[PDB]
Amino acid sequence: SMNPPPPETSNPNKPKRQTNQLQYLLRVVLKTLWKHQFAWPFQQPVDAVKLNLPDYYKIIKTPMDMGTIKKRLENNYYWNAQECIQDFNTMFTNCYIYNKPGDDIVLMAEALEKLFLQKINELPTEE
Numbered sequence: 001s002m003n004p005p006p007p008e009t010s011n012p013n014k015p016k017r018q019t020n021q022l023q024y025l026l027r028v029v030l031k032t033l034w035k036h037q038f039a040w041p042f043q044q045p046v047d048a049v050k051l052n053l054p055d056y057y058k059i060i061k062t063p064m065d066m067g068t069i070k071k072r073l074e075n076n077y078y079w080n081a082q083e084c085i086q087d088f089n090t091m092f093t094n095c096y097i098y099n100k101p102g103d104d105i106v107l108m109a110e111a112l113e114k115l116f117l118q119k120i121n122e123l124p125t126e127e
C-alpha cells in the first residue's frame with residue numbers, strides 16, 4: 001500500500017499575503033483546535049498505510065489536515081482567509097464522508113468543528 005504525496009505547503013509561484021484575518025486563523029483558530037484532546041488524528045495527513053485503510057484515498061480525493069494547514073499558515077501560503085477556512089471545512093467534510101455517524105472520529109471532528117465555528121464567528125473584519 002502507499003500514501004499519496006501530501007498537499008503542498010509551499011509554492012513560490014503562488015501570490016501570498018499576511019492579513020489580520022489570516023493571523024487570527026493561526027493565533028486563535030488553529031491554536032485552539034491544535035491543543036484539543038481530540039486533535040491528534042487531524043494533526044497530520046491520514047496515513048492510510050499505517051491505519052490499514054487501503055480505500056481511504058480511493059474515497060477521499062481532496063485530503064486536508066491541520067498539519068498541512070499549520071504549515072500553510074506559518075509559511076504564509078494563503079492569499080485570503082477564505083482559502084484557509086475552506087481547508088478546515090474540507091478536513092471536516094472528508095471525515096464525515098469516509099466514516100459513519102457516531103464513530104469516534106466523527107465525534108472528534110464534531111467537537112473540533114464546534115470550536116472552529118465559534119472562533120470563525122468572530123473573525124475580525126479585514127483591515
Ligand SMILES: CCOC(=O)N1CCS[C@H](c2cccs2)CC1
Pocket residue numbers: 041042046051053094095098099104105
Ligand atoms: C483525521 C481523519 O481520519 C479519518 O477519517 N480516518 C479514517 C478512519 S478513522 C481513524 C481514527 C479513528 C479514531 C482515532 S483515529 C483516522 C483515519
